[PDB]
Design a protein around this nucleic acid. Sequence first.
DNA 1: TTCCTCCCCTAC
DNA 2: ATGGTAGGGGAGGAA
Lengths: 469, 959, 111
Amino acid sequence: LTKFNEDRSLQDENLSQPRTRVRIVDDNLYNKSNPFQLCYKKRDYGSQYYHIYQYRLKTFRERVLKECDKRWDAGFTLNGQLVLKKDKVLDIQGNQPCWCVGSIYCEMKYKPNVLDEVINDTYGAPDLTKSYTDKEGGSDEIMLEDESGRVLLVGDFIRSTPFITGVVVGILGMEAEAGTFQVLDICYPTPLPQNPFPAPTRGKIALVSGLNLNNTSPDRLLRLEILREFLMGRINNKIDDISLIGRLLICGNSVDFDIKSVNKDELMISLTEFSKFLHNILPSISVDIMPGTNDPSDKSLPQQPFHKSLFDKSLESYFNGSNKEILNLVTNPYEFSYNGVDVLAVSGKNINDICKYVIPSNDNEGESNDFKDDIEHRLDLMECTMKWQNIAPTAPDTLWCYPYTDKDPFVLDKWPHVYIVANQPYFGTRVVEIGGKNIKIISVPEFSSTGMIILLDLETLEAETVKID
Amino acid sequence: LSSFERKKLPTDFDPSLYDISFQQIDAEQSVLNGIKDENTSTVVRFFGVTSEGHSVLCNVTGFKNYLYVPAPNSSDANDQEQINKFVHYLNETFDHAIDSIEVVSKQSIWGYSGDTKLPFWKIYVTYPHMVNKLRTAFERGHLSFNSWFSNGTTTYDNIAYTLRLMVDCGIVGMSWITLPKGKYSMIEPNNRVSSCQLEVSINYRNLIAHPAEGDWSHTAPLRIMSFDIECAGRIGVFPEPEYDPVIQIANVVSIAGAKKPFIRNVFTLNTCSPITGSMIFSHATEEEMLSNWRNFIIKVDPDVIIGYNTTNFDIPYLLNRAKALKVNDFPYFGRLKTVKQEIKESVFSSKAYGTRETKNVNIDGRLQLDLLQFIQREYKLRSYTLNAVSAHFLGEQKEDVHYSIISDLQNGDSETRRRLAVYCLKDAYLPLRLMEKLMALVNYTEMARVTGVPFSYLLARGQQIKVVSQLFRKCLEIDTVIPNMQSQASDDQYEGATVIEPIRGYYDVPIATLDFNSLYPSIMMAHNLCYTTLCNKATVERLNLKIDEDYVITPNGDYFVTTKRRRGILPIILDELISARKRAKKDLRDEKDPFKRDVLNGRQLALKISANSVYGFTGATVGKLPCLAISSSVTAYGRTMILKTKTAVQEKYCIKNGYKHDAVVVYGDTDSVMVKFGTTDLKEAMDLGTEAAKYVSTLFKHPINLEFEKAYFPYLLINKKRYAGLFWTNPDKFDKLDQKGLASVRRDSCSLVSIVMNKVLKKILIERNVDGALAFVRETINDILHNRVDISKLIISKTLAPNYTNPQPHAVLAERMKRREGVGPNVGDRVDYVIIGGNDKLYNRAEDPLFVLENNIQVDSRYYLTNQLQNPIISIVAPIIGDKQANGMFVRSGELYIKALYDVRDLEEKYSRLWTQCQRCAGNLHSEVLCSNKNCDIFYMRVKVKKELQEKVEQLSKW
Amino acid sequence: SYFINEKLFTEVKPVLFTDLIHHLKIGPSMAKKLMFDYYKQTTNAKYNCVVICCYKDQTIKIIHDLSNIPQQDSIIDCFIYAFNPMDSFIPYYDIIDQKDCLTIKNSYELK
DNA sequence: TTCCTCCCCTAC
DNA sequence: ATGGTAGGGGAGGAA
Ligand SMILES: Nc1ccn([C@H]2C[C@H](O)[C@@H](COP(=O)(O)OP(=O)(O)OP(=O)(O)O)O2)c(=O)n1
Ligand code: SF4
Ligand SMILES: [Ca+2]
Ligand SMILES: [Ca+2]
Ligand SMILES: [Ca+2]
Ligand SMILES: [Ca+2]
Ligand SMILES: [Ca+2]
């Protein structure tokens, strides 16, 4: 009986305060240096996509060798012909065990090729191509490139782990047919340091991704408004559970429109509506907007932050200098530092492309050891991406990048306590621990298909979800 | 190395008990040191390989070259003592060379004078070169003996010695010869002159020469050796043999009709790290490398040294390099031990093949099948570089190492040298794959067996030699001689065939197409046209022939006799040549592979140029045996057959005869008639075209046959010899889109026009939305004007010519390239250029694309739009929409920031795709990729997109 | 007080419960009560009701299906959200004047 | 500004 | 030495 439950829910507290309260102050690390930040000037697009691979190999060789000196040691006694030694990937012969390091490179038939599209005059088509691998054909080959050589791999391990291109992990196998390996063991790089975070007066963070605003209104705008109202505490008891949420983090895909048809009309009304929402919510919460893949920002992965011009005049007071604490506008994969808890966030394209590698396409039979459907395998992919020190393995090859020279920001230097990936279809979390260091992998879902916004605690790191409908 | 050398000879081998049976691939005149056989010492050496794989050098000894002259008209000519005194006088005059003078009864090939045979004098000579001097003397009149040949005479049967032996014995090129058991003698190891395993000598009367039909049609296990070299040239200067060494030499020796080669090598100038699957003979000095390569060839004994540009670049470079390095024993690697290989530059000019200068090298005993020549003859392509032909036929664009980086790779380390070695291995395995796909050996073997010329003539001489060989064989069969006729320096031209006036327009009615099968050959075979059937009015009055029963007057007025009187030989030659085309077309009929059906279609389309060249032979004033009374008498009979078809179908399929519509012949070119039956149905238009073909073929004499070729449901008749339509053969699905002549199938038009015209025609004819077609046209005109078409689509190609009067753009460009780089295109090479912008004349304004992509010079866009793209598009869209519209077609900060940000978001997604496809292509993920495969689509594009993205980001920096 | 002609009926744009806070300066924990008593007694004409529902697991859903879901427990509060007597859907939002907030002041001055 | 040669290429 | 002729269309030069 709908009316009587309303009558019961008559709450009539009636003060709640005049007396506006204050959120608990959790401040990002002041802008010092963001490895993912490139001004549009000084971008020298002349170089090629080979300094990236050279730097990855050059930096991962030490990280793999520091582990390979102990495991597979110079006196290791594998069944026979012990390990003979290191080598240069091509300088290998015989059936003796051996181990080298090389940047794996997959070769699938469904990986879209631009030369074929040009020669077929079909360049510029929709790029649906849901998955790359060829499961029902087995034609996928997993090579192991190095400085000089290209050794194909075959065996049982390449059916256990993902083996995504661009990653550099030392392999150990037996040369079978003078061209291939028979993989026997895989060495992941050395463990990477973290920062220490002290145990102590509170904190939370509201994570949200995939707003996807547009002219069509299938509850999207209404869900966004309900979101800001719930973040205002106007939907529940006022304080002590919403008074401390501290900061919001929009994690990409905020404004979705049809580039193919609209001709830039709705891309303005969506931004005006978004700016309305920001002006309504900013006096109450600080906000950090992070560009997605479908947003007014670059398509190269180190996407630079949103421009001040995209936003309505209303927010100009926020964009004034010395107001980064209110609005942030950070680059796409960003390394926040909220009260010491180093949280690394992505828009979620890297894991999407990794799954494009591993997951099959429309097959037209069910594997348990493999055939990642989509439940936990995405968290396993993020686990690997935290093992494989770089956070975008297939960077130059399938999710395009600025052709860096002498440095790659994607390869990690220190692990973050939290690793938030965005726009994932499913919400999940795992407290992964590798090499004595543990991190927390949160996978925020889309706010369009679902309604979840995650509230991550910054003292227990036990994130909880709240579903909006 | 136990796989190189051929199968060892059987131990129990002796001249008796055995029958050496082998396939002769080559034959050349030579002198045989030893006892003269049948008073002659010269021999013809038939190199070959037997069925088991053993070499042979059969010396065919005992053949004496002869000269035919008519018996002089006198009383003493029948006195034997007079003939003996005559041969005595000749020996006095011509170095004791004339052997004898047989009296044989022959007839001439010119005209039907009657069934009586004149007496001729067969003058044998000891060495075959004497016949030239004897013929000159006979023709001028220097002989003075009883006033016999004092005036001058006409000699007969002027053909080379090798072909004379091959004609008399009955040996077609690439056929089988059986030296009978015990009739042949073996050359003793002391007097051997070759490297072959079996080196024998037989009398020409003894050997059995099988025809290439039946049990003897197979092919022996030939050994094809492909190869390639790479030279380390000084910076900026093309490799010159005198100063720039050869550093590597690949090798892919293989057996004909095999899946994979059984040898791979790379002879490198320095140490080279091992490659899997290919030995690596790494030498220390260039002299040792060249000598070991020679020893390698001698040990392998390949039969067919194929390559790509080996005739012009590789082998001449090797020979001049060995000469410059004082390697004196290198240039002897033919099947004969002590014959030096030398370069003899020869020029071949023809209307259908164009002038091109070749540097022939005489590798004795071994064929040569440089694939560049094979493709330049068989296929019309925009360019013939290795990259482009590989991309066309094999379908693969692969990296092409930079030229200047070769020196660095060589002077680096063993790893870099392995990189060079794998490049050479790819370059050398390419021609062999091309040869296996294109079926060069099989097609050329069929050609040399059908016509009769040796395999070496197929790629070094035109069609006249094939007609000459077939003619000589048939005359020999029928006791006839060919009179040596001095060339009638020139003429103007004779009459061609009629091209019916077109009823131009765009037709939505189905357009049947009725054409004759092998028109001119069928006319020749039908009305008995031939040399030995020619006649004149006087002869008819003398012999008292009857009309339409013993002779026919052709529509050109010339007389010929029916088959009752004589059976001309050109009917028989054509019968064989168009009965082999039937059995070559009975193969692609039964062929599934789509790429095999455009090679089996290049074999039926080469036996139809070889049967239409029998006509061209009679029609060629320059060149022996020109008879402009059989050739200007088929053009008539070809002009009274369309004039009769266009008058029969147009007046049978009419309303009076009980049909629905009046038929209309809207076009027709030399045999065809694009009849428009007047019905909209297609299964009924085809059903009527097939009935018309039958009825009309009923009107002509066998074998003339008019068959319903195709149909065009939509038809676009632009002009005379230019049109387009859909190609329907069955009434349920169209096969393809034909474009007969339009600027899209031309090769002197940029690829932009081809693409635009193909898409426009596709829309208009298949999709039937004219408005969508015009919208795409306007979209292109914006691209050209805003510099958004890639140079790959603006490259024009023309064939350089030997001499010019009115300067041409590509000619001035070729001169300028020669002056800039030190080497430019040669006569006969297609030159590629794009038209840059400027003020001076057009010919002064044309540049090599790689110069445009290295200096950023502004491609003239107004010129392209106006000259290249305008007139073709206007011509093909005017029939649909009328001429007027067609000519008309060619005559706040925030929103601003959304632009130049959704433009960079489109350029930085193409930049990465292109410059990572280059990495996926070269395979080299970890080091620099320097490519120069300028026939690659992405070439010229990656640099454009880079230069655009840099500028767009520089511009976006400001906001 | 309750100026319910231009607040509900002639308010023809769908009236959000936050408009009460922004106009009458009332609090949320009182604006819900005002809307409550209004639809309880004051109503005289057709008016569509839209109610939010917050659960123990913090789920916020509004469609409320008019029949039930596990409400038999787990319901903390159930506040009457906006009314839409125009009955179709789709309000529209804009810049709103602040300085009337009893929810929370963010942390910082705007400078 | 209208013919009238070269010049390239194709169609039969 | 070298198969044939018919014909379109582009560039340019002279009258
Ligand atoms: N390279 C050529 C092509 C054709 N013709 C002449 C002789 C042909 O008899 C006549 C017909 O031209 P086609 O292109 O139609 O060739 P055919 O019709 O003779 O062969 P087919 O009918 O089998 O297609 O043109 C020629 O002389 N030289
Ligand atoms: S430019 Fe790129 S695509 Fe073209 S051949 Fe070179 S590597 Fe291949
Ligand atoms: Ca080469
Ligand atoms: Ca025909
Ligand atoms: Ca035809
Ligand atoms: Ca036909
Ligand atoms: Ca003309």
